[PDB]
A paper describes a structure:
YerA is the first identified binuclear metal-dependent enzyme that specifically catalyzes the hydrolytic deamination of 6mA, representing a novel class of deaminases. Additionally, YerA has been shown to possess conserved key amino acid residues that form a binuclear metal center.
While the former construct produced poor-diffracting crystals, pET-28a/YerAGly380-Arg580 readily crystallized with a cubic morphology in ammonium sulfate or potassium phosphate as the precipitants. The cubic crystals belonged to a tetragonal system, with the space group P41212, and each asymmetric unit contains one molecule with an estimated solvent content of 51%. Continuous and well-defined electron density was observed for the entire polypeptide chain, except for the first two residues introduced by cloning. The refined model comprised 201 amino acids and 101 water molecules, with refinement statistics summarized in Table 1. The YerAGly380-Arg580 structure adopts an α+β fold with a globular shape, divisible into two domains: an N-terminal β-sheet of eight antiparallel strands flanked by helices (Gly380-Leu550) and a C-terminal β-sheet featuring three antiparallel strands (Gln551-Arg580). These domains are spatially close, forming a compact structure devoid of central cavities or concave surfaces. Analysis by the PISA server indicated that YerAGly380-Arg580 does not form an oligomeric structure within the crystal lattice. Attempts to express various YerA constructs without this domain invariably rendered the remaining enzyme insoluble, suggesting a structural role. During the structural comparison of YerA’s Gly380-Arg580 domain with MAPDA, we found that this domain may function as a lid covering YerA’s active site, presumably playing an equivalent role to MAPDA’s α4-helix.
Numbering used by the authors: 380 to 580
The structure:
Amino acid sequence: GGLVPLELSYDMTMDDLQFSMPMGVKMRNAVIMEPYMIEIDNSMEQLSFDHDESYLTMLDRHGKWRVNTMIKGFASSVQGFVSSFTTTGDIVAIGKNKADMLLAFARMKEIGGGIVLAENGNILHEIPLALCGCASSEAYEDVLEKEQKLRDLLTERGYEFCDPIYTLLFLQSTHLPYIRITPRGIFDVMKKTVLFPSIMR
């Protein structure tokens, strides 16, 4: 557990894992994304491993809003993956098992923020916020280790692009084409309009 956990005003529940919009974001490379029409049944607690469409939920750090969409091409067997290591402070949850996503979120809060990869009821890997980037040169090695391991695991589970941290960091960047996830919902960068909107929690 955590003596000093991330004191978010909310816990992530199954109600934050309701997916309904027919459109998701598809990775062209590590950062460039385009709209795509979801081709699979996004009502299931567990998604199949024979495709590369994963649930993606973006959650307000303050718990007011959330965006429930799909990301195609991030991975094909990531069960639960949560990161609070964003420049906005907002929370990203990606995966194919809603229970593992909830578990990774709870564990992320327990360790005081950061990155948590969970799988089949267990925590596969975690990086506390202090080790997600090299804030202190003293910790460089540790950072590197924590990072590389994460890479390896994500690469084993279908992440084929160069840098998943890059991906996560630029999901909300409305100046990079072609579609982004914003507090107002998914966002068409070229037409500068909200597509399907966010949900008030």
